[PDB]
Design a protein around this ligand. Structure first.
Ligand code: FES
Ligand code: FES
Lengths: 94, 451, 233, 281, 130, 13, 142
RNA sequence: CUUCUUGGCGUAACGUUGUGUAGUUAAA
RNA sequence: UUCGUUGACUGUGUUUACCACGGGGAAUUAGAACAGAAUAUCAAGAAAAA
RNA sequence: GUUACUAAACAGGCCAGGCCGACAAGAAAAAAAAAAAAAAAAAAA
């Protein structure tokens, strides 16, 4: 109940499901960062782009800090379909 | 990378254990498995062994069936891993399975509550060859097919023919189970005499679970009116048991919540469909038992939302239609409920229809009957229609026209064969619009519009 | 569940007027489909001490520590931290180096319950035809609980309603039953407790937690009120 | 003082494109009329005062206050409002994953966000308050506890404590107070709206009848007099029948003659929809 | 001061089925068919629809399909258009005395051509279903 | 019975 | 006027009173579609409008236009959907799900759409009956 | 499972033709 | 969101509302085809036993 | 089936012939809240 919810101990499986992740809407190049992306690709939020991580975490007041920030779709690992999870498992292992 | 299935001279099939482990690891994910096993050093080669250990050179159908039994025993209900294992088992079942093994796999599928039409197609094909079954095994297979909603044209008549000589001599509990399975499959899935024979066996005959199963079977078969004496007898038999059992049995016991839901469903059906005919004429003991059950709050396990319902909600929001998602009314759950009007939007998925059919299941039909008796109008959006539309504009036009058709109070003819011209699905000029974007006369929301 | 007259009281007038109207009141009643309208008050006292979840404290402390390590935290310059106002209190650690009681059970929430004879319920009053439910609640507070007791009302809308049908003999008098609308209120901290006015129908009062509520109030009333009562297990 | 003969403020001058001077661009039709499109006013032509301390420095101060309170508090308040407006009936618990089995969502906000594919970055952008109306609204209801304390905390100097340590049971208290304290009647505006309109409570059919005791029969009887049954029906249900004469004149006949039979306009406007509360089934 | 005017010009009509709105707000057709009018009681305006049909003889017994009718919503307008429509594109219908000759000549050549000249040869009609 | 032809059957394949 | 309430009761499910237009609407089926013909009181009068609606109902009955059109393919799991105007075929996908595909009659042709649906269902039935899952290979050793 | 958008805005819409500038000719 | 983008494209097809003619130009169709380039938007995510 | 065009008089008066490479084109998305209070920043996205 409420007591158990407050005392909840997230299992490593639950933490893995709650892992955040970037899914790329489209292909694009960074103007200043020169990174190359392909639509449907899946990356870790930590290493995908530090400048975008600034805004995603709360240390940037500009939404244009990463030139391709609008092409991001931030989802949790557990929400991804089995196909994508298996396809990109290697790059999401942390 | 890839799995190889070998076949022998005698029809047996198998795969290498190492290759199976590699296939499972690549199909699910080694990070997922490492998190599940609580170890970051687990290599792909040991994934199958680690899973076996958690649930406790060649792998076979018997091995995978034992894995399923262990998963059921240990309450391991991971869906991705089970799906991969079921794919492999479906591949292996051909020409290498025995009747007890088929029954065991079917029972494991029932217990895990998985819908695997390919696996059950393979099972049916194997079964047709095997039989040119004990009554218990036949009833178990029938229950498996009913749970899968697989109204198979071939095997089902075979099973019913096998059971025909034993019907007069089935025990009351087996008769109740078979009647419930037949009700889930529909009355047309078995010969005409079958329901009469099963009901006679039940009448001659039994725990509270069996009694509630029989009552639910009556409601599903839509014979509660024609079987009033039997329904009254069932309720009279149940009520003492409901009173006798403790209060916490409905909340703490593993078989408590489901029985509570079924009994509340029976109560709601009797209340809203046959208030004057049956409910108000029931014994005071039965009514008091129903009140005692109703007083207790019902608990529901967490569920994920279907993206079908989610998209329907988003389109309603765009159309400014106030609604509630996954609302609760007694034992019933509404996919979408409207706030300002008495209409329930049902985003039916494949599981609500019989395998490869256009016909909704008996449970869905009963829920629709209850929803209509309660005074709510049901608007059904079939999954195939939703997928074919596929587009925001097409779906908005469909929502508007369907809402008008449901809510209209004039021109009340049969809803079927109503005209439809949806964008990019029917032929039309590009700029032919029924829903101009953002345009509402007097800024009136569609939830307030008077059709 | 059982409000019967025997269990309620015998030989009094004001107490029985509310629940049976056997001694007819001196004012005009208000019926809705044959049921007398009544307003019920459910005053609550919030916990007196603050509790913070471990995950919240952990996240906050870890954020502060992470910010300190990474040098990404707020600046908070001295020119905006020290400008000599009467409420100034900050000073760097370096410079420093150079059953009727409101105080009962301070870590939980309490609810004011009232005893009408042998029955434990919430304060209740009848609606006189033509006056607002707010006025009915004010009269309830001023005549049943305390002439100076004025708890803060959370709104003009009820948070729940209940129905009760009279027996055959009582309904033969022309009133089918009573329907009650419940209203929440807050006991303002630092305000005086109840002081039952002379002649008030209330026999006693208590401040009980959710856990103790079923020990006093009937399960029917608990079912009627629990949906609106705050969540605390 | 508090009581004063207030002047009606002059209307703010809505800008216009320097074109179409011979036409009437101020028809009373609703956006977006297919046959009566409305002329747009570019944001670059709306007259706005030059930025000074009254309009810029105040925004900077409020932004600093929001920074101190943390954007997370604003995000949480917005999320709670959005979830409350949509979860006004019992829902089934919703997990965010198909196989988590243990994780719970936290509201139908999940369903809405999944359906609309809402922007995780967009929520942060909104919470960072880049717009004048957003800062003005934070200056008025910026307090975390606003659903229960409204604008009372708009000037309190220890208000940040709510944002820092109002969680769990205290958030539940805020929500439960707000649900009882919020408005539930008809909103009356002529301005455009495009979001789901807030709920308006349905109204019961029957009214309440006053009854007083009569000892002559030892029974309760209605306070109102008898009147004829037809008169009672007219008073209760309405004019009865499909047609009746207009209301009789309540003013003394005018000494002068006026053509009172003439309608107000040659072509009357269309009927107005009923925006009031609906009935209860 | 439109709301005070009385001339019929000031009050525009509204597009409906198979009708577009032009730059100057002209209502223009989008499919081969027959015109129909509707009255919107809610908005108190006239709505112009086109029921799609292939060219054929306009019979007396079919004139009721093009009556002006009262509706409350555009959804009901679409419903009425479907109900009065003759047939659907995917099923077609048996054409009653359809034309068989080429169309009238361009205006700049002759303004007063003859409809269905018996001296001209039959040519296929393969444009009026679009 | 015969049926009218679809849009696909009218393109210059 | 003064009229008995029984006037607005219709004796047949296909005859309806429409009060917005105050007309008697008669439903029928023509050219594999549903149509309704109105009989207005403003045209015929009170009793005559209903009388003419009943006569038209009898005429449609004689013409056989009160019968519901039916679309069938003879193949289980393949059926016509009016909402999308498409032939729907149901089968089991690669993932072992129950899935459907809809072929547009307006685009392919009614019979062309039916044929495409049937052939797709047959192909998917073959693949499913094979029994092999994704990335699977069958090898026979003797 | 055909295809979710698109060749401005403009309730004053720019002066037709000509001259001049400019474009086109492995063809016309 | 403080979100992209430049279709405010290059061409083939003499058919079309209006009509003295001219300025298809108070400002009409996907001439629903064809040859190039570009921009935005995908879909799916079903099954929680006793 | 179907009622809609239509301002002549040195009649009673109107005219500003202009803006925009974009918070002015514009995909996707979003968009204006009763009364009262606070603030005195002409503020929906
Ligand atoms: S991808 Fe290069 S700065 Fe974000
Ligand atoms: S902000 Fe007002 S009490 Fe918390």
């Amino acid at each position: 109940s409420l007591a158990a919810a407050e005392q909840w101990e997230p299992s490593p499986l639950t933490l893995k499901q709650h892992q955040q992740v970037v899914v790329w809407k489209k292909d694009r190049t960074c103007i200043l960062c020169k990174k190359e992306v392909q639509g449907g690709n899946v990356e870790k939020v930590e290493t995908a782009c530090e400048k975008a991580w600034r805004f995603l975490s709360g240390y940037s007041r500009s939404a244009h800090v990463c030139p391709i920030l609008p092409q991001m779709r931030i989802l949790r690992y557990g929400e991804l379909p089995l196909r994508d999870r298996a396809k990109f498992d290697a790059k999401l292992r942390r | 990378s890839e799995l190889v299935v070998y076949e022998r001279r005698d029809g047996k099939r198998w795969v290498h254990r190492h290759q199976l482990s590699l296939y499972l690891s690549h199909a699910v994910g080694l990070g997922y498995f490492r998190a599940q096993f609580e170890d970051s050093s687990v290599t792909p080669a040991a994934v199958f062994d680690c899973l076996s250990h958690l649930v406790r050179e060649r792998v076979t159908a018997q091995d995978l069936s034992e894995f399923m039994k262990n998963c059921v025993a240990s309450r391991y209900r991971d869906v991705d891993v089970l799906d991969v294992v079921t794919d492999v088992l479906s591949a292996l079942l051909i020409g290498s399975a025995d009747l007890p093994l088929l029954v065991d796999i079917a029972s494991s599928c029932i217990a895990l509550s998985l819908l695997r039409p390919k696996l059950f197609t393979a099972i049916a094909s194997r079964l047709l060859v095997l039989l040119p079954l004990s009554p218990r095994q036949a009833v178990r297979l029938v229950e498996s097919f009913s749970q899968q909603r697989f109204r198979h044209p071939d095997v089902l008549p075979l099973l019913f023919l096998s059971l025909s000589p034993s019907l007069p001599f089935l025990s009351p509990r087996l008769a109740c189970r078979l009647l419930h399975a037949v009700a889930g499959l529909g009355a047309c899935a078995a010969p005409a005499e079958t329901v009469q024979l099963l009901l006679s066996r039940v009448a001659s005959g039994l725990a509270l679970a069996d009694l509630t199963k029989a009552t639910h079977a009556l409601l599903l078969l839509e014979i509660e009116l024609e079987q009033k004496p039997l329904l009254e007898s069932l309720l009279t038999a149940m009520a003492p048991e409901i009173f006798d059992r403790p209060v916490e049995f409905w909340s703490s016991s593993p078989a408590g919540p489901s029985l509570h839901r079924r009994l509340l469903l029976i109560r709601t059906a009797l209340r809203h469909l046959h208030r004057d005919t049956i409910y108000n004429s029931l014994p005071t003991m039965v009514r008091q038992a129903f009140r005692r059950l109703h007083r207790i709050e019902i608990t529901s396990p967490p569920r994920s939302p279907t993206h079908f319902v989610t998209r329907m909600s988003a389109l309603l929001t765009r159309l400014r239609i106030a609604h509630f998602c996954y609302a609760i009314r007694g034992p019933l759950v509404f996919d979408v409920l409207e706030r300002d009007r008495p209409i329930v939007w049902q985003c039916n998925t494949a599981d609500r229809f019989y395998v490869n059919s256009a016909e909704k299941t008996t449970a869905v039909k009963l829920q629709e009957r209850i929803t209509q008796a309660m005074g709510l109008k049901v608007g059904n959006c079939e999954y195939w229609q939703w997928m074919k539309m596929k587009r925001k504009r097409t779906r908005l036009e469909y929502i508007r026209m369907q809402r008008y058709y449901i809510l209209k109070d004039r021109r009340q003819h049969d809803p079927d064969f109503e005209g439809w011209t949806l964008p990019l699905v029917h032929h039309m000029h590009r700029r032919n619009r029924l829903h101009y974007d953002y345009y509402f006369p007097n800024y009136t929301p569609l939830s307030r519009v008077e059709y | 569940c059982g409000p019967g007259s025997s269990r309620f009281f015998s030989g009094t007038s004001r107490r029985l007027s509310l629940f049976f109207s056997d001694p007819p009141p001196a004012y005009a009643l208000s019926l809705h489909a044959g049921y007398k309208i009544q307003a019920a008050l459910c005053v609550d006292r919030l916990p007196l001490v603050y509790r913070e979840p471990r995950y919240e404290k952990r996240w906050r402390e870890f954020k502060e520590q992470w910010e300190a390590q990474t040098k990404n935290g707020l600046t908070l310059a001295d020119e905006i931290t020290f400008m000599k106002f009467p409420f100034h209190f900050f000073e760097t650690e370096e410079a420093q180096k150079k059953l009727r009681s409101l105080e009962r059970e301070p870590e939980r929430t309490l609810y004011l319950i009232v005893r009408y004879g042998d029955s434990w319920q919430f304060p209740l009053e009848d609606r006189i035809h033509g006056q607002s439910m707010r006025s009915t609640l004010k009269r309830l507070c001023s005549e049943q609980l305390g002439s100076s007791y004025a708890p803060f009302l959370l709104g003009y809308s009820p948070f729940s309603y209940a129905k009760r049908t009279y027996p055959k003999k009582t309904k033969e008098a022309g009133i089918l039953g009573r329907k009650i609308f419940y209203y929440r209120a807050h006991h303002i901290p630092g305000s005086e407790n109840l002081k039952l006015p002379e002649g008030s129908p209330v026999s006693d009062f208590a401040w009980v937690t959710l856990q103790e509520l079923p020990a006093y109030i009937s399960p029917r009333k608990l079912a009627a009120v629990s949906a609106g009562l705050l969540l605390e297990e | 003082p508090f009581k004063i003969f207030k002047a009606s403020p002059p209307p703010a001058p809505t800008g216009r494109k320097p074109t179409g001077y011979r036409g009437n661009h101020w028809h009373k039709k609703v956006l977006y009329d297919p046959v009566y499109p409305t002329t747009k006013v570019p944001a670059a032509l709306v007259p706005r005062y030059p930025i000074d301390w009254r309009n810029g420095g105040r925004a900077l101060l409020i932004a600093a206050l929001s920074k101190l309170e943390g954007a997370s508090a604003l995000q949480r308040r917005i999320f709670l409002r959005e979830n409350s407006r949509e979860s006004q009936v019992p829902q089934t618990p919703l997990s965010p994953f198909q196989t988590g089995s243990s994780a719970s969502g936290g509201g139908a906000y999940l369903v809405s966000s999944l359906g609309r594919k809402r922007s995780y970055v967009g929520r942060i952008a909104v919470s960072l308050m880049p717009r004048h109306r957003q800062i003005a609204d934070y200056q008025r209801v910026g307090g975390f506890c606003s659903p229960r304390c409204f604008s009372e905390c708009s000037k309190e100097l220890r208000r940040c404590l709510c944002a820092w340590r109002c969680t769990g049971f205290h958030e539940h208290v805020v929500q439960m107070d707000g649900m009882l304290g919020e408005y539930k009647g008809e909103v009356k505006t002529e301005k455009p709206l495009f979001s789901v309109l807030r709920r308006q409570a349905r109204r019961n059919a029957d009214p309440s009848e006053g009854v007083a005791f009569c000892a002559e029969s030892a029974k309760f009887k209605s306070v109102r007099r008898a009147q004829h049954p037809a008169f009672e029906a007219f008073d209760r249900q309405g004019p009865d029948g499909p047609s009746q004469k207009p209301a009789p004149r309540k003013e003394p006949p005018l000494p002068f003659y006026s053509a009172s039979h003439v309608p107000n306009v040659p072509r009357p406007p269309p009927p107005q929809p009923y925006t009031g509360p609906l009935k209860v089934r | 001061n439109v709301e005070t005017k009385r001339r019929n010009r000031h009050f525009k009509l509204y597009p409906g089925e198979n009708v577009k709105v032009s730059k100057v707000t002209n209502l223009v057709a989008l499919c081969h068919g027959r015109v129909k009018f509707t009255h919107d009681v809610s908005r108190d305006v006239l709505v112009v629809n086109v029921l799609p049909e292939r060219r054929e003889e306009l019979l007396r017994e079919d004139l009721w399909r093009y009556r002006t009718e009262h509706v409350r919503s555009m959804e009901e307008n679409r419903h009425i258009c479907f109900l009065r429509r003759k047939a659907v594109r995917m099923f077609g219908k048996e054409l009653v005395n359809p034309p068989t000759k080429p169309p009238l000549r361009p205006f700049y050549f002759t303004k007063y051509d003859s409809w269905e000249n018996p001296a001209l040869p039959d040519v296929p009609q393969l444009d009026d279903d679009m | 019975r015969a049926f009218p032809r679809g849009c696909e059957l009218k393109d210059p394949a | 006027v003064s009229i008995h309430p029984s006037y607005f009761e219709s004796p047949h499910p296909f005859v309806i009173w429409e009060p917005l237009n105050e007309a008697w609407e008669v439903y029928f089926y023509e050219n594999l579609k549903k149509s309704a013909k109105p009989f207005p009181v403003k045209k015929f009068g009170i009793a005559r409008a209903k009388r003419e609606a009943l006569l038209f109902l009898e005429q449609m009955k004689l013409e056989g236009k009160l019968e519901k059109p039916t679309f069938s393919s003879g193949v289980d799991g393949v059926t016509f959907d009016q909402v999308t105007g498409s032939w729907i075929c149901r089968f089991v996908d690669e993932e072992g799900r129950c899935v459907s595909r809809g072929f547009g009659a307006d685009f392919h042709g009614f019979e062309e759409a039916r044929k495409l649906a049937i052939e797709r269902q047959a192909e998917m039935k073959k693949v499913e009956a094979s029994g092999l899952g994704p990335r699977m290979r069958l090898v026979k050793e003797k």
